[PDB]
Design a protein around this ligand. Sequence first.
Ligand SMILES: N[C@H](C(=O)N/N=C/c1ccc(O)c(Br)c1)c1ccccc1
Lengths: 336, 19
Amino acid sequence: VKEFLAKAKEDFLKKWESPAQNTAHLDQFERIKTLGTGSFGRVMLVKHKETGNHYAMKILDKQKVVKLKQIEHTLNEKRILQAVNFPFLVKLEFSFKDNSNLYMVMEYVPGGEMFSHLRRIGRFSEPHARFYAAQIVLTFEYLHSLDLIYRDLKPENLLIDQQGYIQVTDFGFAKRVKGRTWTLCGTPEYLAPEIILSKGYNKAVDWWALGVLIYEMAAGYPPFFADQPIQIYEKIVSGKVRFPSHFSSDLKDLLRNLLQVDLTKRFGNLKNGVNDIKNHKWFATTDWIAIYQRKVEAPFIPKFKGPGDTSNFDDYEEEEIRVSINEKCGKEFSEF
Amino acid sequence: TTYADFIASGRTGRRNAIH
Ligand SMILES: N[C@H](C(=O)N/N=C/c1ccc(O)c(Br)c1)c1ccccc1
């Protein structure tokens, strides 16, 4: 493992220092359907004309990125995404830009969002939730070893592949940082107290977020919720967590250690690092190497009724992709 | 129940990031 990560870091650093750029163009893709939207863009299912492969194409409007002050985050996203490689990270296949937009063309994950499956089914069983959580634990072990903080874990950003394994997407808040950082970003339900309190923070925020995710998966609702974000923040800072009566004692113990306001005590962040999590009793039945190797039988296999099928995704209003005849924000996105 | 409270809340749909 120490050996594996060392080699992983070597690979990452070469790509980090010499990013891939301009590796395709828009007309090589046929636009099929909108798979999702966000504040400054959308993700579309596309077909690559020369191979017939399907991809998910994230299209970000440069002007909207600038208005929302997300230029540096967007540059982070692409630079980091093109440099990483892990079984549970969605792969970036191509990227390019035109007068209007930035494009990131990623592997297509046909099983849909965990969010969709979780809301419909209500909640996952503990073994089911454990299976997904293990994969997140390994992914965060990988990312953090590269000095990356992920900062946007939630079921909306986790996709389920044809084999029932998870694929993490959305590196919009990912950041390579050795010290501590201060940006107030993420999703309200998932924010660690130190982010809310403007303390400056580190990778431990990802481990808190993992606690929120596990809780949400197993309960069917997050540990801290309300109608308005301000009310959510108040609950988080109080930190009083209540668990459903059906949560096992082991699960509760793990969650009390992840949803731990005290940074000297939060799991993931101590002397033993990720091992405090990997060796916790709730994970006793988990074969970490088999998980990594994808040799474990998934608890749930998405229904796939053909290639390019999209029945696992919600329908979104389809809008025209317009490319201005003038270059927008060229200087801001020069490195993209 | 907490579940009923969640389901009746305004945050059971996809949640936006704060920027
Ligand atoms: N948060 C949204 C996001 O990153 N979706 N990623 C989806 C995705 C990625 C790869 C896939 O194979 C599939 Br299928 C879906 C988003 C962020 C910014 C603008 C619009 C949407």
